[PDB]
């Protein structure tokens, strides 16, 4: 929606948008739609904006009200950054799938690396349904399906919360077994060794052994589930 505030001359002399089109203007949660169109890379590209040698096609939209399912520009599937030549035209399209019920204003968007967002035409797109109902899903290479809306989130919590709880336990442990004030005082008076002697060190030595162990284990296990993973695909 920002476009109005953007500098007039930069908006005219960069991307020139034509034939923009919205498959639909109303859609149910889970129902697809395509935003599509063409764009002309102005031949006298302004100094202020880096060469569009590194750019990215996007759905100008207030968060994931519609999930992008695929997109294409210059006749390629474009999940990563693309080059636009100055002077040429490109055609693009973005497959959106409804997620959040409401009346959203959905734009075609391209960001240039040196320069920032360039906002194309947008259109109101009503979405009907209840986000509870929204799913993906998505097929892994091993053939199985997963719903991305929820996939993995349990395992995250299962790892994070126990650790935060362990973290809290340890803080509370020391804060109780020794005071803040008592400890300050003891240290300030001279001892110091009244606050910490082994077997406070025994307790630490054991908690650390338990921690390392729990780390090795949790590593190995997650290695058995999921024994074939790839690095993020970038470039």
């Amino acid at each position: 929606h920002g476009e109005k505030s953007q500098q007039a001359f930069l908006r005219m002399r960069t991307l020139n948008w034509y034939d923009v089109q919205w498959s639909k203007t109303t859609v149910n949660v889970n129902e697809e739609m395509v935003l599509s169109g063409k764009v002309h890379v102005f031949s006298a590209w302004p100094q202020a904006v880096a060469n569009p040698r590194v750019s990215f096609l996007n759905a100008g939209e207030p968060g994931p009200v519609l999930v992008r399912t695929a997109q294409f520009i210059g006749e390629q599937f474009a999940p990563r950054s693309v080059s636009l030549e100055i002077g040429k035209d490109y055609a693009f399209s973005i497959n959106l799938r409804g997620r959040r019920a409401g009346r959203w204003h959905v734009h075609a968007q391209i960001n240039v690396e040196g320069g920032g967002p360039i906002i194309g035409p947008g259109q109101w797109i009503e979405i009907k349904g209840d986000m509870k109902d929204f799913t993906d899903p998505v097929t892994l290479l091993d053939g199985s399906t997963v719903d991305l809306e929820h996939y993995g989130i349990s395992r995250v919590y299962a790892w994070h919360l126990p650790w935060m709880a362990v973290g809290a336990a340890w803080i509370f442990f020391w804060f109780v077994r020794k005071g803040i004030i008592t400890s300050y005082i003891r240290v300030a008076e001279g001892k110091a060794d009244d606050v910490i002697g082994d077997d406070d060190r025994r307790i630490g030595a054991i908690v650390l052994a338990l921690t390392i162990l729990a780390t090795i284990v949790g590593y190995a296990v997650t290695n058995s589930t999921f024994p074939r993973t790839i690095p993020l695909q970038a470039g």
Binding site: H1, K4, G60, P62, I185, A188
Partner: protein, 213 residues
Amino acid sequence: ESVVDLRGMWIGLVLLNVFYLIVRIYEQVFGWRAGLDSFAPEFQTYWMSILWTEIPLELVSGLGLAGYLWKTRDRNVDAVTPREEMRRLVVLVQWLVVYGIAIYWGASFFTEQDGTWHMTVIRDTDFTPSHIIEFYMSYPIYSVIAVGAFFYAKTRIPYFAHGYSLAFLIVAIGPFMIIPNVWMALGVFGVVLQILMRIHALVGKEGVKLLTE
């Protein structure tokens, strides 16, 4: 009488958590549909109203809290007795507890929140909903409270009354240099050591070495 009262803390904690809860809840409501087009007149009525309100109102609360505490300053501060000092230190820790919570909201919650609103707009201005709350509300608020706590100690505690605690100076003025990049104020480390020194002294050789061991 009572060394530990706490009613003032509770008042502040309740009056703060509650206020922010309203604010957060409100931004859920007028964030979506109200705070997306900053050129629409609904932006003026739901977001720019807050900006125009809070800034003058915060600047008055700041100087207000300021003057008031200088005026009611203890004019004979060195005369303060061990029980009355011990009470005042505990009111100072109260002020600081409220400071902590204001720092939590301003520096954690509404700060990292702006991170997610940036992924939800392309921005018509720098007065977005999140910036209005973050830079111009939550930040000034914890800044006011920092000054409060500083002047309390300045005007009620002899240690703080003559000279300036450097840690506390940094804590209260630090804030006005957080507006660049958008140093850190862990200066509370030194202020609680300063409070802990007084406590150590005000407890007798008996309370100390003997009682708490």
